[PDB]
Design a protein around this motif. Structure first.
Motif, short mmCIF file in Angstrom:
data_model
loop_
_atom_site.label_atom_id
_atom_site.label_comp_id
_atom_site.label_asym_id
_atom_site.label_seq_id
_atom_site.Cartn_x
_atom_site.Cartn_y
_atom_site.Cartn_z
N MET A 1 -22.19 81.56 -34.85
CA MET A 1 -22.14 81.01 -36.19
C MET A 1 -20.76 80.38 -36.39
N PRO A 2 -20.68 79.31 -37.19
CA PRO A 2 -19.40 78.67 -37.46
C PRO A 2 -18.53 79.59 -38.31
N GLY A 3 -17.23 79.63 -38.06
CA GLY A 3 -16.33 80.43 -38.87
C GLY A 3 -14.97 79.77 -38.98
N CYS A 4 -14.23 80.08 -40.05
CA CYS A 4 -13.00 79.36 -40.35
C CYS A 4 -11.75 80.23 -40.33
N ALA A 5 -11.91 81.48 -39.91
CA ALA A 5 -10.84 82.48 -39.88
C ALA A 5 -9.44 81.95 -39.51
N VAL A 6 -8.45 82.35 -40.32
CA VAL A 6 -7.04 81.98 -40.16
C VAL A 6 -6.49 82.27 -38.76
N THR A 7 -5.82 81.29 -38.15
CA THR A 7 -5.21 81.52 -36.84
C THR A 7 -3.69 81.69 -36.78
N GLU A 8 -2.96 80.64 -37.16
CA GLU A 8 -1.50 80.64 -37.03
C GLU A 8 -0.83 80.88 -38.38
N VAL A 9 0.23 81.68 -38.40
CA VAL A 9 0.96 81.90 -39.65
C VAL A 9 2.47 81.87 -39.45
N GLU A 10 3.13 80.91 -40.09
CA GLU A 10 4.59 80.88 -40.06
C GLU A 10 5.13 81.35 -41.41
N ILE A 11 5.90 82.43 -41.42
CA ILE A 11 6.39 82.99 -42.67
C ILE A 11 7.87 82.62 -42.86
N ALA B 1 -11.12 85.25 -46.41
CA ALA B 1 -12.28 84.39 -46.21
C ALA B 1 -12.18 83.06 -46.96
N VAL B 2 -12.18 81.97 -46.20
CA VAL B 2 -12.08 80.62 -46.75
C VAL B 2 -13.17 79.72 -46.15
N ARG B 3 -13.62 78.72 -46.91
CA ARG B 3 -14.55 77.71 -46.37
C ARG B 3 -14.07 76.25 -46.53
N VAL B 4 -14.12 75.49 -45.44
CA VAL B 4 -13.72 74.07 -45.44
C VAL B 4 -14.92 73.14 -45.22
N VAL C 1 -10.36 73.26 -49.40
CA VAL C 1 -10.13 74.70 -49.56
C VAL C 1 -11.00 75.29 -50.66
N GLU C 2 -11.71 76.35 -50.29
CA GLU C 2 -12.49 77.15 -51.23
C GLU C 2 -12.19 78.62 -50.99
N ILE C 3 -11.63 79.28 -51.98
CA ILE C 3 -11.29 80.69 -51.82
C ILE C 3 -12.41 81.54 -52.43
N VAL C 4 -13.08 82.32 -51.59
CA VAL C 4 -14.21 83.12 -52.04
C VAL C 4 -13.75 84.41 -52.72
N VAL D 1 -5.23 77.45 -40.79
CA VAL D 1 -6.62 77.86 -40.73
C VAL D 1 -7.48 76.85 -39.97
N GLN D 2 -8.05 77.27 -38.84
CA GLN D 2 -8.89 76.37 -38.05
C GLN D 2 -10.29 76.94 -37.90
#
Lengths: 50, 50, 302, 45, 50
Positions: free
Chosen positions: C44-54, C82-85, C114-117, C139-140
């Motif tokens: 299934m397609p998913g959009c889970a966050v990958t890289e984070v620079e703080i 959880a986000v949807r693009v 960006v859609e924040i559920v 987020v990719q």
């Protein structure tokens, strides 16, 4: 004899893989054999896998 | 150089052994290495350098 | 030989719904149902966050002053965001907040796709009056589980050490269960129903998931040596100065093979290359048994 | 997010009424769903 | 002779020297795997006798 010492501290993160040893508190040992997909997991009527 | 031979010989010595001496020989080597410098000759030897 | 179809899709929550299929022949509810469960859970397609620079963070094992959460805890929290693009395969967002109080998922800057559920979702808390955190959340989109460890092979200069990679959680599906009950359509001997009750994070519609599942399922039925290696190395392997490298790239010289073809005359005719740069290039090329004006005749093979 | 189709087959059959067919590439967990669903259909219907 | 912690290492590419600072010590927060140079060290050995 030693002029100077450089200590680097590494933080390694390992999760779990086959060959690791796992046990309950009852003296029942074990070694993870294969890591199975959620797909192949036995599931109850509720649909919650194990 | 000393390749497959005992020790190695000075350019003048190599000249005595070649009957044609001095600067002459020094040139050949320079053009010899040159021929070994360009690839397809040098690619086998290149990997030896790490 | 009656083929099935869908009927009332009952949405009980933003989380989960029960999709149903009426026209099912003898024993087919199980054959279709379980097979559907498989593909549903797995692919299934998913959009889970990958890289984070703080903000001030070099590694995930530090603690930032002003937040009671450890950095690793904050990454682990983000992984559960959880986000949807729509049009973008990968978007980068920007999170900013300060003052005393919880930082939720609605505190990020809103983008086009960006859609924040879960706006109430907690990324991290803030303990001090003046303390502020900025971060780029990259987020990719992808399929299956892609851990952070296997993510590094390609590498290719992930040098911005402030960027912490996180494990990919790509999948809308949480729990899928299918129950077949006898379904009595007006006139027919005996038919079955398929009640698939699924669990999601809200980032995928039931009809959409149930659609792609059988889409893939049917989609599987579609069949049921001379010259120097050094010549193809990028110019960056020559380890030249930034100026020389940029100049060469600007002159369409991207590899060593391209450079060894050029002559001193031609290179000096370029708008940006002086004698110093040429000296450097000749030096670094000579240091590896190469030079300018080298002919290799046959550029390129394939 | 493109998908994986098989690419290597080799139907090795004994005699005539018997057959053993094989498929190499296949995404994780797809082999069981495919094998099973096709088995159920093959046998029962 | 005395050993050096210097970032000057015989026979290494820029990819190798990248993870080290000017002094030869790996940066804090830099993720590493096997083979990466954490601390550059060099010890004198003269006349290699080839």
């Amino acid at each position: 004899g030693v002029l100077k010492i450089v200590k680097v501290y590494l933080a390694v993160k390992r999760r779990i893989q086959p060959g690791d040893k796992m046990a309950g508190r009852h003296g029942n040992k074990g070694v993870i054999s294969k890591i199975n997909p959620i797909e192949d997991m036995p599931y109850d009527e509720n649909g919650t896998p194990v | 150089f000393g390749i497959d031979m005992n020790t190695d010989y000075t350019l003048e010595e190599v000249g005595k052994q070649f009957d044609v001496t001095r600067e002459r020989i020094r040139q050949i080597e320079a053009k010899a290495l040159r021929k070994l410098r360009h690839p397809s000759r040098s690619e086998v030897l290149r990997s030896f350098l790490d | 030989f009656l083929k099935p179809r869908l009927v009332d899709i009952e949405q009980v929550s933003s989380t989960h719904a029960k999709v149903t299929l009426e026209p099912l022949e003898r024993g087919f509810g199980h054959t279709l149902g379980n097979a559907l469960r498989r593909i549903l859970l797995s692919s299934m397609p998913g959009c889970a966050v990958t890289e984070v620079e703080i903000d001030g963070v070099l590694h995930e094992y530090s603690t930032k002053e002003g937040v009671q959460e450890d950095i690793l805890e904050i990454l682990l929290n983000l992984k559960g965001l959880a986000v949807r693009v729509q049009g973008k395969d990968e978007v980068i967002l920007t999170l900013n907040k300060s003052g005393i109080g919880p930082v939720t998922a609605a505190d990020i800057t809103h983008d086009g796709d960006v859609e924040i559920v879960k706006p109430q979702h907690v990324i991290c808390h803030l303990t001090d009056e003046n303390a502020s955190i900025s971060m780029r959340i990259k987020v990719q989109r992808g399929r299956g589980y892609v851990p952070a460890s296997t993510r590094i092979h390609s590498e290719e200069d992930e040098r911005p050490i402030g960027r912490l990679l996180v494990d990919a959680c790509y999948s809308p599906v949480e729990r899928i269960a299918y129950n077949v009950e006898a379904a009595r359509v007006e006139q027919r001997t005996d038919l079955d129903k398929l009640v698939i009750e699924m669990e999601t994070n809200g980032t995928i519609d039931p009809e959409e998931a149930i659609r792609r599942a059988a889409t893939i399922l049917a989609e599987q039925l579609e069949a049921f040596p001379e010259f120097d290696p050094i010549l193809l190395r990028p110019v960056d392997d020559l380890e030249l100065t930034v100026r020389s490298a940029n100049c060469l790239k600007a002159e369409a010289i991207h590899y060593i093979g391209d450079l060894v073809q050029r002559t001193e005359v031609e290179l000096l005719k370029t708008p940006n290359l002086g004698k110093k740069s040429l000296t450097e290039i000749k030096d670094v090329l000579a240091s590896r048994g190469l030079s300018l004006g080298m002919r290799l005749e046959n550029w390129p093979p394939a | 997010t493109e998908f994986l189709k098989p690419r290597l087959v080799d139907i090795e059959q004994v005699s005539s009424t018997h057959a053993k067919v094989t498929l190499e590439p296949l995404e994780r967990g797809f082999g069981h769903t495919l094998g099973n669903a096709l088995r159920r259909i093959l046998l029962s219907s | 002779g005395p050993e050096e912690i210097t970032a000057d290492i015989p026979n290494v590419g820029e990819a190798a020297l990248s993870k080290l600072d000017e002094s030869g010590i790996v940066y804090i927060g830099a993720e590493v795997t096997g083979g990466d140079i954490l601390v550059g060290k060099v010890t004198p050995k003269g006349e290699t006798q080839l």
